[PDB]
Amino acid sequence: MLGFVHTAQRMPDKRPAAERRQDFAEIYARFSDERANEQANRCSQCGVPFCQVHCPVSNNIPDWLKLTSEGRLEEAYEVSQATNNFPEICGRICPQDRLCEGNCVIEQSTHGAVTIGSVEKYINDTAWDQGWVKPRTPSRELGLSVGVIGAGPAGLAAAEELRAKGYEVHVYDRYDRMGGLLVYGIPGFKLEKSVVERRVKLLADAGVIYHPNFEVGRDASLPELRRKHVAVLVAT
Amino acid sequence: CGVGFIAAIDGKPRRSVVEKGIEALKAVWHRGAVDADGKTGDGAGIHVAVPQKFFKDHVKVIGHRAPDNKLAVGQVFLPRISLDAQEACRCIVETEILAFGYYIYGWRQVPINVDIIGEKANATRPEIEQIIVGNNKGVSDEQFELDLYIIRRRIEKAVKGEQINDFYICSLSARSIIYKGMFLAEQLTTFYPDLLDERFESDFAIYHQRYSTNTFPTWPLAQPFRMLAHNGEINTVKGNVNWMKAHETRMEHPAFGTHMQDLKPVIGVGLSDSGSLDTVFEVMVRAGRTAPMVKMMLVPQALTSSQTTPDNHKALIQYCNSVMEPWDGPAALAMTDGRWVVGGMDRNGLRPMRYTITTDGLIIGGSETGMVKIDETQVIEKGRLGPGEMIAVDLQSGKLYRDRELKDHLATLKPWDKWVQNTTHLDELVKTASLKDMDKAELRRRQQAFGLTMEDMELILHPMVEDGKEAIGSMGDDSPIAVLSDKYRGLHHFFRQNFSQVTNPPIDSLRERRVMSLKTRLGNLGNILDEDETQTRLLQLESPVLTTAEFRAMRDYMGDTAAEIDATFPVDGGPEALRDALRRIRQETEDAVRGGATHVILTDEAMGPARAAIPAILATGAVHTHLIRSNLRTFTSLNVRTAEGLDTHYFAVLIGVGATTVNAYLAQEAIAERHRRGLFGSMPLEKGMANYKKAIDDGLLKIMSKMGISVISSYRGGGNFEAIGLSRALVAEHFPAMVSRISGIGLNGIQKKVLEQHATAYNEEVVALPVGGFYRFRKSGDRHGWEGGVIHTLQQAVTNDSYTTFKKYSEQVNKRPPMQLRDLLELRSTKAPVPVDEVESITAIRKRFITPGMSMGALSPEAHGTLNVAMNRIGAKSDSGEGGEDPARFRPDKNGDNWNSAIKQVASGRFGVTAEYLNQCRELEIKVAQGAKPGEGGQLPGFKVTEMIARLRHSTPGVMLISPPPHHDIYSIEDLAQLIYDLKQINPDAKVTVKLVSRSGIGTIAAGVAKANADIILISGNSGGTGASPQTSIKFAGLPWEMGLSEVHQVLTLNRLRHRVRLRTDGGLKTGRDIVIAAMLGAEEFGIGTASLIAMGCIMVRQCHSNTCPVGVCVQDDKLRQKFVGTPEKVVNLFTFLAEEVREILAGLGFRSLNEVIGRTDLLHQVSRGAEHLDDLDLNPRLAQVDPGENARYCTLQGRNEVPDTLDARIVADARPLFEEGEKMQLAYNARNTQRAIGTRLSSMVTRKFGMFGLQPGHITIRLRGTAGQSLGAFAVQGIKLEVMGDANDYVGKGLSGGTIVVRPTTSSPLETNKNTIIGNTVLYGATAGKLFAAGQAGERFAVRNSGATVVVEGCGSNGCEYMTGGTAVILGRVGDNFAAGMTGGMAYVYDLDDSLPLYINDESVIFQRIEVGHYESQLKHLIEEHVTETQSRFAAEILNDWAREVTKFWQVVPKEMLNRLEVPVHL
Amino acid sequence: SLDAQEACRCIVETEILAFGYYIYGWRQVPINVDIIGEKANATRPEIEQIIVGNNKGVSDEQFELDLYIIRRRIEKAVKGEQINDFYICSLSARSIIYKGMFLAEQLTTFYPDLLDE
Amino acid sequence: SSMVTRKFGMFGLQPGHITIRLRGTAGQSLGAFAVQGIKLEVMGDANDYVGKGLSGGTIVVRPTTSSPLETNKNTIIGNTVLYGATAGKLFAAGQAGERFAVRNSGATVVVEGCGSN
């Protein structure tokens, strides 16, 4: 299942600038299914994997790589989203040229890095369409009060983890739309807001409490937020 | 070293037998080790009959009237330094003899001459005396001997009751006498002058010359024993002792009587293996059987499923296999009862045996053939002993018995076929009964309780289900040892598999499966002295591994005889719950076995959230040891159902502990769960289970063969393992005899580990197993030795020359938490620091490191050349490896580049060995085993071997090459000494070096190799790398090099032999701290190896075997080789950095060179962790210091060791006209069997002068008269001719390269040419080119590993042309058994006369047919014509005469891979 | 020999641990063999020390009596295997013994441990 | 240099055929009369008369890799460097001394700052 001997690296697609110059959607297309089965077959399962050690979350890349190379996308999706939250957006925004795809042993030998981010995007795409995703709601709710400040990625991930534990989470933010700067800071040109809306609705479905359009500086303060919960998280 | 025997066929005693025995012992001085003192020896012995006339004359001179019936003589060794102990021994023996009403005549002091014994052996000399006993009761002589034997036993017991040391009864009997001692071989007749009277006469005489292994002697342990004279070793000495201790409780026979109670512990304490063999042999013989019967019942013949053997012999083999466990091992036995005299071999037939029959009714057998002087006009037949065969002489009727007729006479006695059919085998019983399932959540919970991964589980198990072979690793181990591993680990990781290195060579399970058997018996244990039909009434299973169905069949067959025992302990129990559970199960098992039930089955199915599972290893060990100590194991079979075992090592360690059958069920349910989702494709579950069982069988066979044991019944319960990190009391109470050199965790730690794992498994709600990080690195856990950051740091530091970066590297490496033993040692001193300038120069340190060998087949030629260039540039010694070397590299380049290799290897393959390849060196190295694959030898994949590799190794392109595990020319330490003699003969200026692997019990091996005139020892660690090897062999084989190094240094300076060797090590030497600590422990040189590879470009991808290394180090394809990045300067920078780091450490310590620190072990201390909860590992036995005395701790001598000169000197003086003018020379000489390596130094001289193909064939011609010694014409280059009249000993033509050797019986010989053995075993080992026209039969393993040579012989032994690769072989006559095993190249022509070839030949990878094309017929005719022209063989001429009808008589054999590569198809 | 040393170590360890006392470890006594004659160096055995702690929290008299019983049991057990030259000089918590075959004038230069303050 | 001159002559070996590294402070007259094929590299500083009579060889001076100094603002060699050299190279890093490269003819020298004359 090495593959990289005779095959060649090929990106999903790229729309030419003749018509790309005017739209605001993404310039990359979904990965073809047979292209997915071929490109996944490109890694060599390098012992002591450098691909993982540089990915700041250090998810299990070669495992789902092998899986996608052979199939069983449900098992691969499960083992992918186990240790990484928000994979759909992380695999799309993070600069893999220096984080994960910038140190694969295939690239270091000048052969051409295996497209890791594209396979991450693909495996997170088809998994959601057929609906192999359920909100991680807890059982036997512990019972306490916890709150976060700022709906950014850090706050959202913290809230997801705490709701999976079984606390009562409260999200505060200044903006009217939730999701940190993914809906206001990052341009839609590089990331469609549809997937962020989908993920944030999934998060809300788990039992997360929202408090949109709030400020800790004027409307409230630190003693108030501290007394209102057990502990307060600051992701401003 | 060697045995021998002489017997009179008719049976009339005479002086000639004893005289010939003395003469034979006078000419075995060249096999045994040579001492420079000229006095000391290993111990010799002779065994003859009692000369009644001499003793009658003696007692008559004393005054008594000589009685008319037979007398009896008893030889005793009493203490000498004291006086009171002598009186005690004398009164003991006198009262014990006079307790039986016998009559005692008197004592006798033996005159000796003690001036010839050395001063080391004279210190422990016992007072030797004899006692004379008559017979006043007039009883028969059989009862006389039996009473004498009982008296001897009771005397031994009584004197053991008083702790009177150094007392030994040699032989108390009325028929035989034994003269043995610790002198030399020749000087025997000058120490015992009693053998110089013309009155001594005997019809049989046995003699032995042993080969000691330690400089310290011991008189009571010299051959021959009271009933035996054995040569060789014993692989199964623990299992047999344990099983005999089990059998002791039910041995009763009316032949003994009440005194039977005195003979309970038959196997005494503190005796050698052969001693135990002798004592059990005598105990069985005194019961009533005949000597051939017990010999066949102790060392049986290898039962094969063929049709060459009749059915009576088959029934006999089945009976003897069902009676008693075998005793495997290389053994050449020459045993004698009072009536029979038998001589035979073991199952495998390793050690040779050759005999001669004279017209005077005299048979002479021995290890060599030219020992005694016999005229050619007196012999009738010369024969040899094959596998398991035996030759006997009956003295009463005065008859001779060869193999077939003796076996028939033995089968004549009892109706075996009326008893063997009383057995039962579970194939139809399970098949007929078979034709008459768990939740994934609970499965995951149980797997998490036992801690099985997900990635690795389906990585090592998947090839077993899909393909049926265990997975193949790619690089060395670096995971920490078990005791320091943070995460949970099973019990099986704490056990390392043993393996024999030199003292007994392994057996190749891939090519010799015929002597391999996995049969097991249930309900066969009974009285060992009784014979009846009831014995062979049992259940027989073809494989000890059982699935669920077979287990249900066996259990519901046993019915009510079974008794289950729960193997779980309460989780809520206190700190001592585990010990209480152990005691509970022991008591339950004892009571159950007492309660009539005769079968015990361990089970842990009740595992759940309330009770935890007892480890299976500990449970079965406790149960088996308790049953042995309670004398109840002989009534009950033991079965275990484990829920953890997945790989072959677990089953191996579960069987070795003492189990019989196991059914690891959880593997089966996991496999079924995998198959139900459709992952294995279209394979039905039946095929999956079949492949799983087959893979487990093959793996277990491999682990057994790794130490030379071919029978499962003797390996069971032997305890052949090693514990590294268990408490001493634990393994000494609840485990069989196994040594743990360092103490480890006791009971509390194990209970804590199992409890924490159980809690993290059940008490939570898990979903999926962890990713697992055992075999490959993952971010979860399981810390390794080489991670990403450290690799990048080393590479950047070596490519940028920034020594500060290398210091940062070293700090990063040393900062990691403990992972090896060498991370638990601190170093301190007492003197003041010394500035770094005073430390010796860097170059004097860099010239010490070496680069271990790496086969050219493993890694691409670019890396090999780069390493060679760099190392030869800095001045050190690089290494070549097993794959040979290209000749075009034997000269320096134009740019001052030296691409040659300075150290050459002589491995077990002998692939590229050549007379020219052995002179382009400075030091030769001998390979025994390495740290990754200590038993199975190096292997090379199929798609790796290119055309260049085929040219280097003289082989066929694109074929799987696997090297034979055992050195076919090293079957004993004497073979090692002979091989070192050979190597030092062929190269007049190089050094020799052995290569061992660190394991327990290496001290005796160290002393032996030091006595074998070696130069440099090499202790290789257990974490070395490799090109390819099985995974289990990588993970669980070997021991840390600190243990081996400390043991070797201690045992080698204790014997005052340190000033003649140079110790060198490698394995996991990453930074300078490790090098300094190793130098302190006793090292003198250092090998880096794998680290250097990473400096060259490797990034530890662990895909060496897949031919797809992305960097381009280990690949043979052309494209990937372009991706190389190495440079000869990076290795230079790495070695410079290492040297500077060692310099800094030494300067900070307070010394000025490594010479002042080697052996100064007192500098070290052991620190430990406080809250680690680990029971402290006592490292003191490794830090113990023994004082060498006057000799320095590192003392050495310049130049290689000396060696006596052979005939070759006398040859190279007379041949001076050739070396000075190139004129033809023809010589003749008389060669005795003592002269070794005939015609080798001349080969070296003529290679250095002219070359290999420099002379025309037949330039120098030599003729020899008599019998040539072993290894005749080793490495005979083209241009030399050697014609010897007589016979050769063995190894003739070893490594032949272009020469021409011819043997023949002399013209005065009245024998038939094609019915008499003329050459010995393993002829033409690794031959490359030349011709060999022989006239006579050949020994065992004929033309093994032959590649290129042209050989014509008349007959052969078993396993002929084993692993053949090239050349032509023409056998005229009967072939042995299992002919053409694993043949891959060349072609063979066998002379058929009885159409019996298909019964014998092996059709694995070869095809046989009739001769078809006239071209090959003409070539065969040319070969036969040349053979006739050379030796004038009459039978060859008679074959030639009838060509028209003899053309269609032969059979042609060709490999299955040379068919389509042929230039002219053999088939029309 | 060396294997006999391992048997002796495991004997004394499995007999001390049968009562409950926790072993701290061994210690090799640093000696200086050079001041030994010839007839004595031929039969000089290895000298080692073992350290045991009283973690049971028992009075001194039961400790001494238990160590005496341990010594007798160890002697009997090792006699059971007929091992030669194994001698426990003194095992207690009140006194220690330094004895040998050297002269009387070189004692302090044979066992340097006796020169510490 | 004398040995290789007797063996291969003045220009018998290609440049860099044998290289030597020196740590610390070299003494006087470093590389006196070194023929082509020799290469010397000293880490530290040379005393005086360095490279005298150079004919074809190669000398290299340089502060060690841990130097906190400034290269072109310190002295690294002595006086009368390359007195009457014929051929070869001399690469340094630092200020030379007085009488730098007097009577030079054919050599190639590269220095960062020098002294009078």
Ligand SMILES: Cc1cc2nc3c(=O)[nH]c(=O)nc-3n(C[C@H](O)[C@H](O)[C@H](O)COP(=O)(O)OP(=O)(O)OC[C@H]3O[C@@H](n4cnc5c(N)ncnc54)[C@H](O)[C@@H]3O)c2cc1C
């Ligand atoms: C391809 C790429 C492009 C990128 N482009 C950009 C870019 O254009 N701009 C950029 O900044 N980063 C950019 N980044 C970086 C990255 O997007 C941000 O660093 C990251 O999203 C910040 O996460 P956060 O945890 O700070 O969340 P944030 O979204 O920063 O969390 C802040 C949230 O808290 C709210 N808040 C702020 N103050 C208060 C307060 N006092 N009380 C209550 N709520 C408050 C804010 O309204 C907001 O909703 C880019 C990264 C990549 C890989």
Ligand SMILES: Cc1cc2nc3c(=O)[nH]c(=O)nc-3n(C[C@H](O)[C@H](O)[C@H](O)COP(=O)(O)O)c2cc1C
């Ligand atoms: C890639 C590779 C190939 C090797 N090939 C051989 C070989 O052919 N023969 C041999 O005896 N040892 C071979 N070895 C083992 C080395 O000779 C040496 O024993 C070992 O590398 C030392 O341990 P280390 O891993 O710490 O360097 C090989 C090792 C490696 C890594």
Ligand code: SF4
């Ligand atoms: S990027 Fe390279 S090291 Fe990482 S998984 Fe893929 S092939 Fe293996």
Ligand code: SF4
């Ligand atoms: S692109 Fe994917 S693999 Fe790379 S760092 Fe981001 S999440 Fe990890």
Ligand code: F3S
């Ligand atoms: S891991 Fe193996 S494939 Fe080459 S790069 Fe290293 S030797």
